[PDB]
Amino acid sequence: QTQDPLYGYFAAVAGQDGQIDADELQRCLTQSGIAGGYKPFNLETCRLMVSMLDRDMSGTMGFNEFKELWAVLNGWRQHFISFDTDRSGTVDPQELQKALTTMGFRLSPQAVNSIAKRYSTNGKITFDDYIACCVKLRALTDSFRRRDTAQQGVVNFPYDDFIQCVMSV
Amino acid sequence: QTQDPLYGYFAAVAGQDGQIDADELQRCLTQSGIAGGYKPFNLETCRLMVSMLDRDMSGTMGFNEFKELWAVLNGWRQHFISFDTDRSGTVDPQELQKALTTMGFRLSPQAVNSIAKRYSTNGKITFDDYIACCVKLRALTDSFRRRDTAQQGVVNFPYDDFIQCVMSV
């Protein structure tokens, strides 16, 4: 069995059960350099990542999930860079719209406006907020799709299931 | 017409249109001392507050909304203090459950677990995360109730409306 190059970072912070929480993910994401020159992800953003991958509200994730996370974040960063050619670490609401669309998110104009207002300061969205945005979008889209068993694009949400689901991200 | 004691803090940071964004709210919340000894609210948490009150994704709020916000946060802080008598600035998942229940949130046990995992580090929830939790809970509960026109406790969410709504908080 081949050694995976991500394993050292993970093994150095995992608990006794072979899992990591948000705090430990924060550390191994920073050591592993996934942000590649941009500001490293804060604890809050790492909590969102944990929920996106564990999809079970344990607050922890295993190595296989860490590897999947790492590949997803690597691709999102490359995508961001194609809009941030000068590497400012920011992007504007027009660039954000086009960035979200091209990565497979299907969003009405007012959905995009909701998102721009949510994450912009001074007409700009940081790399870190862009990633947080993508993590939460993918987690919520996975949650919605999971529940849309009839594939109608509409989900019937009981209140407590809605709260459970949306408060995890 | 009587002067309101909150107006000075608001007027010092409002834009030309008489509204404030999250950044300006952050400043006037800190100057106004609403956190009362606990750590002042960060920008992200102030973004959630703006969405809770404006309920329209403009990213801004007026003075009347600021006043309502201030009263809501004052009551939540008092409520927190009744569980944080020694004023550690933290609370544990058992205290959090009872705190949420007594302030009128109706949450199943697994909804509460979702929330504890989402905000706890080392078995503790900070005052600032408690407030963020309450802001998001009230905003999402308002969003759900608004849409539950038949009062069945179930809402039919189209995907883009779901995303719009949940990405604002």
Residue numbers in the entry:
A (entry chain A), B (entry chain A): 30 to 198
Task: Copy text verbatim from the article accompanying this structure deposition.
To investigate the structural basis of Sorcin activation and of selective calcium-dependent signal transduction, we here solved the structure of the apo Sorcin (apoSor) and, for the first time, the structure of Sorcin in the calcium-bound form (CaSor). The comparison between apoSor and the calcium-bound Sorcin structures sheds light on the mechanism of cation-mediated structural changes of Sorcin, which is fundamental for the comprehension of its function. Upon calcium binding this interaction is broken since Asp113 participates in ion coordination; the rearrangement of the EF3 loop causes also the exposure of Arg116. The superimposition between the CaSor and apoSor shed light on the mechanism of Sorcin activation induced by the calcium binding to EF3: the binding of the cation promotes the movement of three calcium ligands (Asp113, Asp115 and Ser117) towards the E-helix where Glu124, the bidentate ligand, is located and consequently, a large movement of the D helix with respect to the E helix (about 15°).
Sorcin (Soluble resistance-related calcium binding protein) is a calcium binding oncoprotein expressed at high levels in several human tumours, such as leukaemia, gastric, breast and ovarian cancers. Each monomer of Sorcin homodimer is formed by two domains, i.e. a flexible, glycine-rich N-terminal domain and a C-terminal calcium-binding domain (SCBD), endowed with five EF-hands3031. The SCBD can be divided in two regions: EF1–3 (residues 33–134), which binds calcium with high affinity, and EF4–5 (residues 135–198), which mediates dimerization. Upon calcium binding Sorcin undergoes a large conformational change that allows it to bind and regulate a series of target proteins in a calcium-dependent fashion.
